Curated annotation (Swiss-Prot), chain F:
InterPro entries: Bacterioferritin, Ferritin-like, Ferritin-like_diiron, Ferritin-like_SF, Ferritin_DPS_dom. The bacterioferritin (BFR) complex is formed of 24 subunits (FtnA and BfrB) arranged as 12 homodimers. The holocomplex contains about 8.7% Fe and 8.0% phosphate. A pure BfrB BFR is a hollow shell with an external diameter of 118 Angstroms and an internal diameter of 73 Angstroms that binds 12 heme molecules and up to 600 Fe(3+) ions per subunit. The BfrB-only BFR has twenty-four ferroxidase pores which serve as a conduit for Fe(2+). The gene is bfrB. The lineage of its organism: Bacteria, Pseudomonadati, Pseudomonadota, Gammaproteobacteria, Pseudomonadales. Gene3D superfamilies: 1.20.1260.10. This is Bacterioferritin BfrB.
Length: 155, 155, 155, 155, 155, 156, 155
């Protein structure tokens, strides 16, 4: 079904954000596992898988709309060097992602692509839940202390 | 455990090949599904998942060896425009991948990194199975005709 | 609950499109069954049932909003006389239907009937899935040839 | 139990034919599998297995009759270079095999070795069933065309 | 996939050894069964089947590498005339087989055919387990006496 | 089946390292259990059992190759006096062990004893897994603090 | 709990005996398996495991009593060169072990370490059962002859 060109460009930009997130969260996951912080590693792994699922749906929608999904361009990964930095890197990435989602939804609404809007809204709900998780973890580090926070994520 | 620097470089090169394959096979899968060739779409999806699993193990090994896994650089995806071209693109990528795996195995053997060799050997077995599949599909197109071949991959 | 008069007119227009679709798809289903193309017959039957379910929800919404559902004024059926034409007739009907759904959603949004909008968005998602199916079937006929396409839908 | 010398010689000739057939059918099976024609590969594998079972019974009978089973001498394998030729090569081998079985049964009857006759009759029934299968496949190639026939044996 | 010509020669030489062993072990098995030494017969039957499985994998690999598997040439069977001789004939064949396997592995390693090497290493592990079995049986005959050794293999 | 004399010497050297590890890890396990650090005690017990299983496979291989497995000579146990030292002693032992395993594989390959090489590669994989565990534990002590690290290994 | 210095010395002497026995029985076990006397190998394996469990309890008791368990000093293994010698070597070791156990119990009794006495008594019961087994096997060799005795321990 012939999609609006600018909708497809928005979907490719959201996809590009998801492709960064997949790799950033997967590396953070495996770093935490290597450091023995296996509960963080497992949670971050599921965050990476969630972004893979979103990327799949975006690719499928782009192709239905007769666009070309862009899996070739990969933007800058934000890789931290300790647990606090890694969480902040994820949060910075997620805040960019939700800003971009809001702009894409505006445009879908304007051209009456209500099904693309509904998909992006579902993705936005997932990303806001990730922001909630990340903000909460950074808050917990302040409340229980970094050593206890890390201890609680060993097993 | 402090790994050999050139082993880590080889492992990052193999990882780079897997990251290309993940995206190339995932997009090819979703194109085939979009076109109604769901048996090809499903099989290509499982190829992409297998490359994801290989990339996971490579990332884990690099970190254990105290290297930095490179998930930032993404090489050229080879995307075809019809089924025959897509299969040939996959095959061309796999032949590059198995060349690079053989050079990495040589270097692991020379520095006595036998565990990394064993991992790469397992990955090479998977990639040669993929080559078998691909060559066979291209041969079947010649034996049964393209229309029959595509028909056989609809459902 | 007293609904907006023009919303109710839009809902009756969407209902009228669904009523056309029920009959068009049911007849196409039974034609395909009579011709021995039972997989097309079964799939087209399920498309008719899904339109019956949408019509039900639309009737229920109109009555809630204190309007009169119009089941009397049946528009023009697009009945094909061979498989490719029947698929194209369904596609043409669906493209008219999604155009009408988008205009109805615009009006629901403008008068703040957000529950009617959500119902229509759900119907639109189903209709775009039907468009995806239909475009894919027409593309398959081009890729595998008509004789093979029909063969694959006998059983 | 001391058997008739010429019976044992007949049994060793039949065994020689079965030994050719085991290897010919096994190679043809693995060629078809390599070419992606897995239904042919599997069926031909089961034909090879059946000849292995016949060879076992012949070896066992020869030994009971105080003869020496000849597993050293292997006659000429008839290997085809495409599906049609491979089937005709199997059929040519089978027609020689059933001629030899008949001449062996005649001799068993003449010297009153009715148990060896019964064994050979059972093998002959199996080989005639194989002839039926082969003649029928060659007929189907003519009726449905080679491309369809091979297509029907991919999966 | 275009294999190394000399790898294919090595694989065909190992296949030739396995084809000798299939027939030698199958005949020894059926001799032992005929003599009422059914535990030896069963064990030797399973040795024969294991060689059949190795031959299958070798044939499959050769075909994948675009070579011709040689099932026509059959080398000399070493058939014993009593239990001790049959075990020593099996051991003599196995010692030749493992020498040939080591030479094939050297060459696969030198041309970087690491998957062929892995297959041959697995077969070598199986052949060395058979050598352990055989050496052990010959040692048991010395320790418990031939009459007891045979008694222990009747049922 | 007559093995290469130097392969057998290498296999006996690997066996000797495993025999040290069996006893070192068993003692460390029972020390940690006596101190109430039962999660460390249990993990270290499983490390000792794993070395026992490797030793078994090496003994079996040496005998098949018609050598004499040396279970008489026991090298120096590296016994720590606190949790950090015990972990480092295990790590020092494993690093010597993997060095010796690599040299043994080189020689197996040279004389074409590919089955002995495969066995040693499998043991090497287990030993590198143990090194990963040990390095990670030592790093966790620095990230969470010793008191938290020990607390986290009190209970099974 | 602070133990008697001489009790701990006794426990360490008993521990030393158990450490010899672990290794002597494990080696004898694996020798019997290599020779194909698998029932002897299995039984001797279980004797070795039993000594491992005794050593564990002694280690635990020594640590509870605030002593240092000596796992460093390993006494002389008594390795036999045939089945009779191996059994007699085991028996010789066991007779030394039970003498040492009796002297240790005497001393535990004199200083009122009744729990250590109970542990040693349990170990002594196990070692006397092993003596029973060993004396009985040596007697069976005389009664049934070595060849039959070894035959009975093949499977
Ligand atoms: C274009 C980028 C990618 C896409 C669209 C994608 C998509 C997917 C999807 C749809 C799944 C299945 C999730 C489920 O339903 O359970 C999956 C699984 C997985 N992915 Fe990805 N993926 C991508 C990249 C990656 C990368 C770069 C890695 C690793 C470095 C990775 C590692 C994995 C793993 C380990 C699994 C689970 C496989 C299993 O064990 O079942 N993926 N991916
Ligand atoms: C090229 C030579 C041969 C090859 C590649 C071959 C291969 C095989 C294979 C793959 C199997 C199935 C094993 C399993 O998965 O359980 C098998 C079974 C068997 N083979 Fe062979 N074989 C060969 C020659 C022979 C010969 C010469 C004989 C007897 C004279 C024989 C007798 C048997 C028997 C009796 C079975 C078991 C069939 C059953 O009851 O399931 N094979 N063979
Ligand atoms: C300090 C010396 C040793 C101690 C304290 C010790 C202790 C133990 C214990 C407590 C068990 C568990 C038994 C059970 O409850 O099932 C065990 C198992 C075992 N041990 Fe040892 N052991 C020692 C030395 C050895 C040696 C030298 C070997 C071999 C060369 C060995 C081989 C084994 C094996 C194969 C098992 C069975 C593991 C399994 O499959 O679960 N042990 N040992
Ligand atoms: O693709 C990328 N792979 C990377 O590693 C990476 C970056 N590494 C930052 C160092 C993080 C780190 C890794 C392992 C470890 O043990 C400690 C650490 O601090 C930065 C940007 C992009 C990438
Ligand atoms: O990342 C990338 N996304 C892409 O689409 C792509 C490329 N497209 C080539 C056209 C493929 C195609 C897609 C859908 C369809 O319906 C028909 C088609 O021929 C080439 C290089 C890299 C990329
Ligand atoms: O199709 C039709 N929907 C309607 O509500 C309807 C009619 N309303 C009757 C009023 C019901 C209260 C009368 C004739 C036909 C129709
Ligand atoms: O023992 C034998 N092994 C063989 O391959 C063979 C023969 N091969 C003829 C070529 C068959 C063939 C194989 C693979 C392929 O991909 C295409 C092909 O046409 C002829 C006589 C005897 C033997
Ligand atoms: O293919 C072959 N079939 C054979 O029998 C054979 C050979 N026979 C040696 C005699 C073995 C034997 C069988 C039965 C028996 O009761 C006593 C025996 O000593 C030698 C080389 C090759 C072959
Ligand atoms: O074979 C050996 N048995 C031993 O105990 C031992 C060594 N002990 C060092 C002290 C360890 C220790 C144990 C219990 C405790 O409560 C505190 C501790 O610091 C050193 C070398 C060899 C051996
Ligand atoms: O630690 C030790 N390992 C040993 O092998 C060993 C001794 N071996 C004496 C010979 C045993 C033997 C093994 C295998 C075989 O087939 C025949 C045999 O007679 C003596 C003292 C200490 C040790
Ligand atoms: Fe007897």
């Amino acid at each position: 079904m012939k999609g609006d060109k600018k909708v497809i460009q928005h979907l490719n930009k959201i996809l590009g954000n998801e492709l960064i997130a997949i790799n950033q969260y997967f590396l953070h996951s495996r770093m935490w596992n290597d450091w023995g912080l296996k509960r963080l590693g497992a949670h971050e792994y599921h965050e990476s898988i969630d972004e893979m699922k979103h990327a799949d749906k975006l690719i499928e929608r782009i192709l239905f709309l007769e666009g070309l999904p862009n899996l070739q361009d990969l933007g800058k990964l934000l890789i931290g060097e300790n647990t606090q930095e890694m969480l902040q890197c994820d949060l910075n990435l997620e805040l960019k992602a939700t800003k971009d989602l809001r702009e894409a939804i505006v445009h879908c609404e304007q051209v009456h692509d209500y099904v693309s809007r509904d998909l992006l809204k579902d993705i936005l709900e997932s990303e806001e839940e990730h922001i909630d998780y990340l903000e909460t973890q950074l808050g917990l580090i302040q409340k229980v202390g970094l050593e206890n926070y890390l201890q609680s994520h060993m097993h």
